[PDB]
């Protein structure tokens, strides 16, 4: 299954480190998971049942920290792995925080604001007796953005009797959120590609990227790597096709363009090539930030990228991966990524704790600080274990969970 | 599964009665279910993680209350199965509880002194979340016992800061269990007894009655009907055979028989009979107090027993009730039947929550009052729905647990 | 003001004893008034705000008891001078309770169950900062009965977080209630009849009544005088006229006769008479349980009546009083009367406390146990400083509330 | 030191048992010990700082249990000896309680009622941390009482935010106190009085009564013994001498007496005799309720009753213990005859606990039930060890609180 | 009425903006209303009661913030409409708080150090319930100290069982107050008096400025605009009178001059002009830190100020605002140039709760930020909506407020 599969990358890494066997366990096995059926009163009087979920992983290093899922497909073991990640994610970055993850079976396109408002807040009441912002900290995932999370943050506060806000993370601005929000992930993508070329030896300046996708991720990726690094953005690629020229995109032009034109398909002055294609560019830097498997068996052999910056999750796969390592082609594991979102909700959770925010410029320094901090940690296992990276990246994380569930007993 | 076999039986007595369907849904659907993997230290020094569960199904009536088990083939699934069951057990003895269940998937025979009680204090402490006087109070089952119950009582009261003493119930005498709490179960089936044969228009001076079981239920009930009613007990069965003799057993000499040597078998005065012949018997009350599936298919149609008092639970298979019925034989639902270890361990809880406890007398009367008052409870409905009187506890249960959900909102 | 007024009513008898001044004046001042306008959504979108208040005058004595009224027509003041008596009624019966009162400025009969429901949580939500099963415990009053204490009891326990049920009285019996409820205000107006004929050496069986009103009040208190007391109901009178017959009715018939006809006019065998006859009607007993101000200044002199239970609240006015007490017809103040009803509450809570319920005929045992007591505690003190009753009631409440303030500090 | 001494008597016992010496360390030495300085305003402005004790001995049985003294020679040890003796007198009556003591070294004589008031106030509120209804219920002792008591209770509710009135014992009736308070003491003694007689074969109606003292034990215990078991008090004692009279004085003229005129002397119809001399009168039942070591080495050898009735603490001293048993002298242990104030601070604590609150019958038959039930239990003890019944009482009080602790962990 | 009033102004800038008529209800109503009447010790040994209020008016952006009066003219009124105003005023700074306010009808002239203390101890400990370092936070006003605060302080941790000091703001420094404090407001004005000047065109060098009243907001205004924007302070009134010259006043000189002579008047080099003279002086900046209605119908006609900088509260009474803005002189509205009192307040209550204290320089960067910010942000609001700065301060905190409630819910 999908948990077992999670597991089963662990257990490569655990293998490598000698990592004792009866603690090994504590770590593969999540330390809570609630499952809640409560009613939800729809707008035709008639009462509907939803399931919900909530899984605490691991909290050894911290309170747990993972996003809420609203989705009809959504199974525990869906849950269980994606809070499984979060543990070793949270780690890779050094934040204090534990592993977890939560969602509701259920269709939001299927329901009004009202029903949505009503089912958002009986979910955080049923799984409050196991949250709290020294506890579990939720925040928002697929199809929930920060106005759910607003109520869930009031839910809480009306419920224990003041103000929290630092129960949940992905709030508004104007309510407890963080500045540089939605550039988070972006940035970290811009700072983990910008040290791959220094490693390679790449002048960013003369650095060619390619980036296939252009959702958040992609968008904010390749306009900073642009106008912050100077690398020449080359092409980008929308779910549908993608665009080339030599000459460097002006990143500004294309965002703008597929706002007012969904996709950047048909954008003058650019090549149409497929996103396959894309992939097989010529470019010192392959930033993939759609879907995944994108980098798989075939693919990995025709790759003329010298190093590829996981923008999204998984775009590469454990073939391509053997392949692409074989081949000497650096592969920045995902987890060290696009964390910087995960970053960002940190310092979110910590002004609420003071009450006290930073402003745009406070985040993104401490928000690329803790990336090369990140990234250098990583180099350091990987030439100690003389791995790929992603796997140094995991071995680095289950050893500092490793170290804390030691020290603690 | 052997959750939607307990809800398929819901299903039957809610369209009975109109109960509207979108509240159907939350009554069959559990509140919540928290599986946890807790660390314990074995003697060896090593630790090992346990899988342990704790199920609240409805709590509109009150606070969740329900067992733990203790067994090496624990699935979740019958730990809801079990919870459901709970929340339609209280309800029809009209108790202020909710339903609730728990096990750890643990062979406790594995396991020393030392480890069990680790056991027992971390996973109550895992669980605790959850629990509470006024929310979840478990109570034994399955291979735990007055011993395990104290720790549980005493990780609760020095966890929280204070004695507590009412987070469970089956504790020891001398530390705020309850009396009564051995022969309860007995009692409740001799209570029910006298009752059918009072409907049934047979003098219990006369009444012969026919025990299948020997264990805490079948020698107490022997006993008490026996005593009490003057019913006399022509045979009992051990778990590997039984004895019969019209005159009569002498109970008492029967219990001590069983206490020196291993079964009641071989005892003398006794014609050697099989377990399945006992169930055959000619006499006029068949308490079936060992296992399930006693009374099927091949049995029903020859059982000369006018009154089925069911000690255990699930002697009698559906197909077998069906028969039953046809019949004309009257069988008491164990729901009803058995419910005497609940309803005395809500005494205890009643007792601890004040800090005074009752005297012996005290709880007899007042676990045989509710018991005439359930019984004649379920008739009311039975005759009302012309069902049988099985069908007609579970209906009374749905009822009074719909009845509480609607008041609220 | 309607305050000011009840405090000049305090005023006499604070004379009457000598009551330190410094300490007389946070007797008459309440402890603490919260004035709550909280928002509800309407059922068609739109939201509406409402005025509420919750008063505790004091709780030296134990938590603040007192009702909750839903009306268009209700000031602060009213509130205020609610809570002012509710202190004194308790204390005169001598339970473990302090004062209070609240209310919400709302017309329920232009509000839809749903939106009853929504403003009932919301308007529980917002005084909770302030009640508690040991702080405040709510009831009902005016426009308010079981089903909204029910939402009450179920919101406040959703919000801690565990089954309260002792937050509020009144609740449903299959939801924490107590029996006897109904009939209890009934009863206190029975049990005082009866003391108020043997002072007055008058004997029951030839004892005429007449009652004012056939609400609650005088339907069980006529039924309940009549079989139990034996006393003859010669009259009795609807909310529109009243009817007389010296051979004495059948209450029960009476009762069902208004059931199936909104008045009790119109039935056979009652020569029909006008209510302010009815109180001139030669009767030992006269019980008005109906409207304020019913004996007044004219019908004073033309008063019949040996003894005069106030089952209803305000009944006689002060210048009938005076005439009244001046003519030598005894006058049971209301407080003491019609407090069975607080009593009942009051075992309820205590039922609630322990989770234990008692049965109907316990809990009548206890109410007319404590009501002969307060009957009793009220004469010696009217012996002892000559005066109404009414005034000794009152003396004896202030007397103990100012005890327990002493004592305390 | 005191301690030490109180622990030696305890290993007595300790050696005629089995018990793990490994646990007996755990008996002996206490749980807690908090010592406090608080300052405190006095009335000419100056702060004055206090030493203050609490101390819990043992909690293993229930919350600790134990009064405060206020006086200028209070030292730890005596505190910690006093606490330790708390926790077997608690057990030897089976009370669900532990062991507790407290004290604060202070002069009441040189204080203001301002000053004892703030003083009491702090106090409390300094050992708040600790205490608490379900931790730690204080009561009273030398120079306070149920005014000092009524503070406590007054600052804790105000400190904690609600009533409580289960935080401390002693209170006044009219504020949470229990009726039989005052004479609870004087029929314990009563009652191991008569339970004396019925093991000396001694018909209590012929029987002859000598009480050394007059305070509220040897009154009440006087008194009591006349009027309920008929038994002749031919003689009982002031602090300045004692009278004699075979005739059986008239108790009730006794106690008026001595309220208008200081001492029981000068009497009329009453030989005057010394307090030696009343301890060797040929007497059947010899109570002192005085002073320690009343009866020591030198009375030992002359003392002709029958049976000794500890109505004090420690009257007789160890070496007449060896002396008295010697010669078949009973001698009920004062943890067991004067057990009867702890009996009902019980009772007090429990109606606190449900606010509801039993009459004065109530009371006293559950404190003589209990009373007859600890004595029979004790002689059981008694005749299983063949031993002195006072050595019996702790053997007793020791196994109990062993098995809470065993079956705890 | 007062609050009345100020609805009024509310209502204004409600109306220029499409807001939702429900909602804007609820912004007008106040949460919470808290009055009570406590009983304070006089040093005669005589009790007394006190009336006190605390107001919540709204909570939506944050925990409600608000000073505490002594003053026996206090009506609740006033109360309600200083909190009201709270509100907006902690909104346009973009403060995380909500709006709160509170008083006690007393003079404190008349009453001594040791009642005061304890008459401030009993309050806080009354309005307790309902404040907290979450959900209230109290600060001084009108006749109310660091050393009122600090009693706050100490009551409030003593009551809660630890040290909270976040509870209340405005404490001595060296006790968890800010550095700052007393510049605070004056330093707002400062950074006001400049941006107006830039807004303008003004060169400060040149600048002269007029300041009417000699209070903490005049002196360290006056100060700071001279030293710190080098604007010529030409003028500055003692509440008695003012004095001029163009040459520019030190500073320094006059503050010192005042604090060894009460007033500024009479101070050599200042030709002597009437309060009413020195608001028509042909002055740049008129900086208004006195008095109510100062700038009224009359002297708005002759107003030669090319700015104002409403250093006190209403200095410009709205008939004067009309004639203002018509004539083209800018006034920068209160709520925001004296807000920097709170700004720092804001501050402080930060340091507080990670206990962690800021320098002196760091308060001022960051008090001078906000201002800055504060300011830009009015300024958007008034262009957007051609207004008077004064409405479109109300504008931006309506909205904000406004948009909190709506995603909140």
Not at 46 to 69: C, D, L, S
Not at 222 to 244: H, M, P, T, W
Not at 251 to 272: N, Q, S
């Amino acid at each position: 299954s999908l948990y077992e599969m999670a597991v089963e990358q662990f257990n490569r890494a655990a293998s490598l480190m000698d990592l004792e066997s009866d603690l090994a366990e504590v770590l593969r096995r999540p330390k809570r998971v609630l499952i809640v059926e409560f009613p939800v009163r729809m707008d035709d009087g008639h009462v509907e049942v939803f399931t919900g979920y909530r899984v605490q992983h691991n909290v050894a290093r911290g309170p747990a920290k993972g996003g809420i899922r609203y989705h009809p497909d959504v199974t525990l073991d869906e849950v269980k792995a994606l809070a499984f990640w979060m543990t070793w994610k949270t780690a890779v970055m050094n934040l204090p925080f534990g592993g977890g993850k939560g969602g509701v079976r259920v269709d939001p396109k299927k329901l009004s604001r009202n029903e949505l408002e009503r089912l958002s807040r009986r979910f955080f009441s049923e799984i409050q007796v196991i949250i709290g912002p020294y506890n579990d900290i939720p925040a928002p995932d697929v199809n929930t953005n920060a106005d759910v999370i607003a109520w869930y943050m009031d839910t809480y506060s009306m419920n224990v009797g003041h103000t929290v806000l630092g129960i949940v993370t992905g709030k508004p601005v104007e309510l407890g959120g963080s500045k540089g929000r939605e550039e988070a992930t972006g940035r970290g993508v811009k700072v983990c590609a910008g040290l791959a070329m220094d490693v390679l030896g790449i002048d960013p300046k003369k650095a060619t990227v390619a980036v296939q996708g252009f959702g958040n991720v992609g968008q904010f990726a390749a306009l900073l790597i642009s106008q912050e690094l100077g690398s020449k953005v080359v092409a980008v690629s929308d779910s549908r096709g993608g665009i080339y020229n030599p000459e460097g995109f002006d990143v500004e032009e294309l965002i703008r363009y597929k706002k007012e034109h969904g996709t950047v398909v048909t954008y003058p002055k650019g090549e149409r090539i497929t996103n396959e294609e894309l992939l097989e560019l010529d470019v010192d830097i392959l930033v993939p930030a759609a879907l995944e498997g994108a980098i798989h068996a075939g693919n990995a052999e025709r790759i003329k990228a010298k190093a590829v910056v996981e923008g999204a999750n998984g775009p590469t796969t454990p073939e391509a991966d053997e392949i692409l390592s074989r081949r000497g082609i650096l592969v920045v594991p995902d987890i060290l990524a696009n964390a910087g979102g995960v970053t960002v909700s940190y310092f979110e959770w910590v002004q609420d704790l003071q009450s006290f925010f930073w402003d745009l410029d406070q985040v993104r320094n401490a928000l690329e600080k803790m990336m090369k901090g990140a990234f250098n940690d990583v180099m350091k296992v990987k030439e100690k274990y003389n791995v790929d990276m992603r796997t140094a990246a995991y071995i680095l994380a289950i050893d500092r969970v490793a170290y804390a569930t030691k020290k603690r007993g």
